[PDB]
Amino acid sequence: GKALVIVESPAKAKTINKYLGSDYVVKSSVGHIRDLPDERGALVNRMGVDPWHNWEAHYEVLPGKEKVVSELKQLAEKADHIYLATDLDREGEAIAWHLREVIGGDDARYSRVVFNEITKNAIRQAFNKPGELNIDRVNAQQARRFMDRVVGYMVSPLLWKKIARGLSAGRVQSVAVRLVVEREREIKAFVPEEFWEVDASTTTPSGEALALQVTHQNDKPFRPVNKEQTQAAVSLLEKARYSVLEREDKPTTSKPGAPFITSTLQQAASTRLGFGVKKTMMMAQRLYEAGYITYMRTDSTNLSQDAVNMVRGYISDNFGKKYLPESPNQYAHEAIRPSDVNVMAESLKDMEADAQKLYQLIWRQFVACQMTPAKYDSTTLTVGAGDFRLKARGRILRFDGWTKVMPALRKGDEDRILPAVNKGDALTLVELTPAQHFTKPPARFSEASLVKELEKRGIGRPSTYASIISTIQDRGYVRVENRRFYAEKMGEIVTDRLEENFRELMNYDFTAQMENSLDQVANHEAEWKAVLDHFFSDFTQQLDKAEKDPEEGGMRPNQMVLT
């Protein structure tokens, strides 16, 4: 009679139900339903996957989920068709697969609808032409879960034996920790170096103040390394005659950033709002499931024609023609953007204050990215003083452009304003001011700028950045203090062990290559079991070698021997 539609959560069921007619009956599975718990039955059972019997698995219904299973089956018989409207990512394809497996029935009974936002039009087109479940994406998702399970359950026991009980190892988690350990060690080994700068405050012919910075001496960059050198330079500069060597006036511009993707969202939310990766991703999700923003797991800065056309109309009505570019800006699935540009952060219904703030950030970035650039009149004055050359920078805002959508400025607005001076003009020295500085050590990773580092290295993945970040934290390898990452001693002890006995597993390129391999499975360019066999072959040669006595090249035990 009617159609059954399955989503993964109550919040999502409610939202999507506003856009589905009486023919459809929405029901949230309210969870994952089914999942995982030279052989050794012992291991296979705990893992729920069997590397020695072509990877057959044993999925089991979750606790208290039996009522849900049975509640779906009967609803399935009273429906003519079944639509799996899980989220568009691989994990979402696997969950759909599990629902289809559990409920059973002809495959023709099922359809897999895809949408990256829950709006009337997005839902309409999603159920207009519903595609089929994609087994390749499912295999790509399970291949990941399998190798993750293998490393965790087969490396961890070795760590208990060799280092300490309760420790964990993670295919990617251990690589993420490595980045933190290397960073921790760069910092511990840094030797701050001394270097000086010299500023000069002068007077234009009119008498207006002009501040300068010494740049060259004898046509060579100026950078003394001690107090004596600066003084010698200072004595020459006190007697020198100053004059404007050259004035270069040129117009500059600044462009709006591209619309957000998972990683950039996390960084900006962390840098501007002080939100950790977990917080940002939990609010993003609720915004998404409430129908306010597009899917929050993406690495595409692409924007649909309608989205661009709706925002351009908003820019045009609320800001004006000079803020609208000739043609739309194209940045090279969709970015994270509001679903309706006319819905303001302040109009959100059941969203807490911070969730509204995240929406605001997303909204502003989206509107800004389709606006014209800001224009500035930049000025660069070069000054000569004996064998010295000095500099003064400054710019004037000519047209705010995209920055009009961002809060009003209030600080060093018009970063420095230079007075009226022409080439050949004479400046009067009023005061010299030398200053001592010291090179700083590399910044400590932040939850977000680590995702950034993970992204740059092709190690992360929109759907895993969050988990990775939190999954390496309560295991005693690294900790977040003052919003920063600190490597624990145990994080170093384990990292060296792994690098020594599991080189390939800890290598950055190989870890990145595995993501490619996973994309290949998803795109029918590689078969999942063969990819897992190869992975396992490489893994077990590493493992057996590590298992041996250290005098055979096995893993070093965490000990300190007697006299």
Ligand X SMILES: Cc1cn([C@H]2C[C@H](OP(=O)(O)O)[C@@H](CO)O2)c(=O)[nH]c1=O
Q: Can residue 266 be called a binding residue for ligand TMP (CB under 6 A)?
A: no
Contacts of 529 (CB under 8 A, 6+ apart): 54, 55
Interacting partner of 522 out of ligand X, ligand TMP, none (Cβ under 5 to 8 A depending on kind): ligand X
In 51-203, where do the E strands start and end? 56-57, 60-61, 79-84, 110-112, 194-203
Is the Cβ of residue 125 or residue 380 nearer to ligand X in the bound state?
Answer: 125
Which of 33, 268, 371, 522 touches ligand X by CB under 6 A? 522
User: Least distance in Å: CB of 137 to ligand X?
Assistant: 5
| Bridging pattern class, strands 209-217 and 388-399 | antiparallel
* Distance spanning both ends of the chain, measured CA to CA: 83
User: Least distance in Å: CB of 199 to ligand X?
Assistant: 51
User: Residue 263: helix, strand or coil by DSSP?
Assistant: helix
Q: Can residue 463 be called a binding residue for ligand X (CB under 6 A)?
A: yes
Is the Cβ of residue 372 or residue 446 nearer to ligand TMP in the bound state?
Answer: 446
Which of 261, 448, 521, 531 touches ligand TMP by CB under 6 A? 448
Interacting partner of 280 out of ligand TMP, ligand X, none (Cβ under 5 to 8 A depending on kind): none
User: Least distance in Å: CB of 507 to ligand X?
Assistant: 19
User: Least distance in Å: CB of 438 to ligand TMP?
Assistant: 18
Helix orientation angle between 447-456 and 173-188, rounded to the nearest 10 degrees: 110
The DSSP call for residue 434 is: E
Instruction: List active site positions.
Output: 295
| Interface size with ligand TMP, residues (CB under 6 A) | 9
Contacts of 58 (CB under 8 A, 6+ apart): 36, 37, 45, 48, 49
Is the Cβ of residue 174 or residue 266 nearer to ligand TMP in the bound state?
Answer: 266
Q: Which of these ranges, 253-261, 269-277, 516-524, 541-549, lies near ligand TMP under the rule CB under 6 A? A: 269-277
Tokens of 339: 């679903």
Number of CB atoms found within 10 A of residue 168's CB = 20
- Of all residues in this chain, which one has the CB nearest to ligand TMP in the complex? 449
Q: Which of these ranges, 22-30, 89-97, 235-243, 549-557, lies near ligand X under the rule CB under 6 A? A: 89-97
Q: What is the CA radius of gyration of the chain?
A: 30
Query: How far is 455 from 57, CA to CA, in rounded Å?
Result: 31
Helix orientation angle between 528-547 and 508-522, rounded to the nearest 10 degrees: 150
Q: Which of these ranges, 84-92, 483-491, 529-537, 539-547, lies near ligand X under the rule CB under 6 A? A: 84-92
Q: What's the Cα-to-Cα distance from 431 to each of 88, 202, 217, 394, rounded to whole Å?
A: 65, 7, 18, 20
Per-residue interface string for the shown chain with ligand TMP, residues 274-293, x marking contact by CB under 6 A: x-------------------
Which of 29, 217, 270, 298 touches ligand TMP by CB under 6 A? 270
Interacting partner of 446 out of ligand X, ligand TMP, none (Cβ under 5 to 8 A depending on kind): ligand TMP
Buried-state track 232-249, b at ≥16 Cβ within 10 A, e below 16: ebbeebeebebebeebee
User: Least distance in Å: CB of 184 to ligand TMP?
Assistant: 15
Is the Cβ of residue 10 or residue 257 nearer to ligand TMP in the bound state?
Answer: 257
Please give the residue ranges that form the binding site for ligand X (CB under 6 A).
88-91, 137, 144, 297, 461, 463-464, 519, 522
Binding site for ligand TMP (CB under 6 A): 270-271, 274, 443, 446, 448-449, 483-484
